[PDB]
């Protein structure tokens, strides 16, 4: 949904574009520690 505006991954960590929220590197983060994954593998 937000990926591809303003908003990207990288392999353990996601950065958006200044000005766009970071409520996908929140939940990215989030579900990266409940899961033990990274936020690379998942998707906003």
Do not use: E, F, M, R
Not at 7 to 14: A, D, F, M, N, Y
Not at 23 to 39: E, K, P, R, V
Request: charged content about 10%; proline content about 0%.
């Amino acid at each position: 949904k937000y990926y591809g505006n303003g908003v990207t991954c990288g392999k353990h960590s996601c950065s958006v574009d200044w000005g766009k929220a970071t409520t996908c590197i929140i939940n990215n983060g989030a579900l990266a520690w409940a899961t033990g994954g990274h936020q690379g593998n998942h998707k906003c």
